[PDB]
């Protein structure tokens, strides 16, 4: 279906240590494929998925150079932002940048993004037209003018509409055996008395990919929100995901309730009922 | 493949 490539960059200042901690990761869809950690010994961008290992030395030298440059820029930014907010040099602060692109099911460009945050809140972002900026406050307005003068959007736009999308299609093809697979959810139901007069029904979806899935409870074929609970979709550790949805029901009415599961890997949406 | 060579400072 639809696909994305995204890069994430976090830097945390550490007053009393020599330099901020900088951690960068890259994903295609929900799968991690590279990382960099400023504190680790290698000082290289490292492979995290098997299909990226085939890239040759020019690729790895280039990606390591860029991500090292990016650590330096985040380091200067943490100082600039402290100065802009007149903040003490004693505190630890955070900078985050993410960028990337999406393609559709036809694999053509859908949208690109580039966003930045300071201490967990929006600072500046490129808008969807990839020509203009939104700034959170007056500090960010000075940044925005600077980036406008320097034609940052133009260069980001060229990358996101071009290289970002091409290298994504390249990865999708070189990793096709794992990136273009769908693992349909393995599905079952659980039952527990929670009271004398109540029972909980829990509907499980396991080992599915991609992470996107929808789980809903109905009663008499009508959607049920009351006394339900949905957990956050969680990673299994092996490249797949898990989720469940529960409903507490009057005991003896279990058979009125039905769990409904939709996933790309399912030719048709499953319906489950207690045993 | 990342954006490069690098970003302007904020």
């Amino acid at each position, epitope marked *: 279906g639809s696909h994305s490539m995204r890069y994430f960059f976090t830097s945390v200042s550490r007053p009393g240590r020599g330099e901020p901690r900088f951690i960068a990761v890259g994903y295609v869809d929900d799968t991690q494929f590279v990382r960099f950690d400023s504190d680790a010994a290698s000082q290289r961008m490292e492979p995290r998925a098997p299909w990226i290992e085939q890239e040759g030395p020019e690729y790895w*030298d280039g990606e390591t*150079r860029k991500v090292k440059a990016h650590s330096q820029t985040h380091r200067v930014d943490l100082g600039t932002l402290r100065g802009y907010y007149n903040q003490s040099e004693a505190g630890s602060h955070t900078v985050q940048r993410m960028y990337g692109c999406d393609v559709g099911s036809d694999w053509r460009f859908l949208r690109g993004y580039h966003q930045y945050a300071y201490d967990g809140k929006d600072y500046i972002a490129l808008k969807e037209d990839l020509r203009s900026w939104t700034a959170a406050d007056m500090a960010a307005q000075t940044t925005k003018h600077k980036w406008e003068a320097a034609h940052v959007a133009e*260069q980001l736009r060229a990358y996101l509409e071009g290289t970002c999308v091409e290298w994504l299609r390249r990865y999708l093809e070189n990793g096709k055996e794992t990136l273009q697979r769908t693992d349909a959810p393995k599905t079952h139901m659980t039952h527990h008395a929670v009271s004398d007069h109540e029972a909980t029904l829990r509907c499980w979806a396991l080992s599915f990919y991609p992470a996107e899935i929808t789980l809903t409870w109905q009663r008499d074929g009508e959607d049920q929100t009351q006394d339900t609970e949905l957990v956050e979709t969680r990673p299994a550790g092996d490249g797949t995901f898990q989720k469940w949805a529960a409903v507490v029901v009057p005991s003896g009415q279990e058979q009125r309730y039905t769990c409904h599961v939709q996933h790309e890997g399912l030719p048709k949406p499953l319906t489950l009922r207690w045993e | 493949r990342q954006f490069g*060579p690098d970003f302007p400072t904020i």
Partner: T-cell receptor
Amino acid sequence: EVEQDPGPLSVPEGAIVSLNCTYSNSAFQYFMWYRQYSRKGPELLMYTYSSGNKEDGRFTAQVDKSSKYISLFIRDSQPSDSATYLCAMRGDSSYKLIFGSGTRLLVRP
Amino acid sequence: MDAGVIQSPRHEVTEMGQQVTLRCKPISGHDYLFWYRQTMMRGLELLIYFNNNVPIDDSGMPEDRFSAKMPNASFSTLKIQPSEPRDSAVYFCASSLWEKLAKNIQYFGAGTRLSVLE
């Protein structure tokens, strides 16, 4: 590796001059020209992203990424244009430039 | 006029075997610094550049005898030890800023002309 003919080129004042470079590596994306006078540093003239045609006064820089061939044209050449002309290029992984070996131009008064 | 990039020494003529030190002060406020050299044999070529004082690309540094440092934003050094006749060249330092580099602008010093003799 970029290939640039050394010349020297000798042309009469008022002539159109054409300089060029060829390259091999398709990762190059940014193309530039410099002038350097005898015993001095290089001076940026003109600079072209990706493809296309770029005019400034008597200068036109051009890039053809299909043919991997870049060129600079100087209209109405002048004695003060007499210099060595170097092309330079890079990709987007680094600010490191690769330069051609230069063409010496003599514009005769 | 604010100063441009300052290099020193302007000229150096020295015997092989010695250490040579080339120095560069970038335009103050600039956060990138480049070292190039130019000879007849290999042309004009990047040795190393720094950003925020850290070496970013040093793929053009000779594999032995050459060392580049930037201890602070105002000062870089390129050292050669022991020097050899083939090190003779003009060495250029340049500095720039992101917004100037996006337009392929950098600011060059006047260079150091180095002859190392047998």
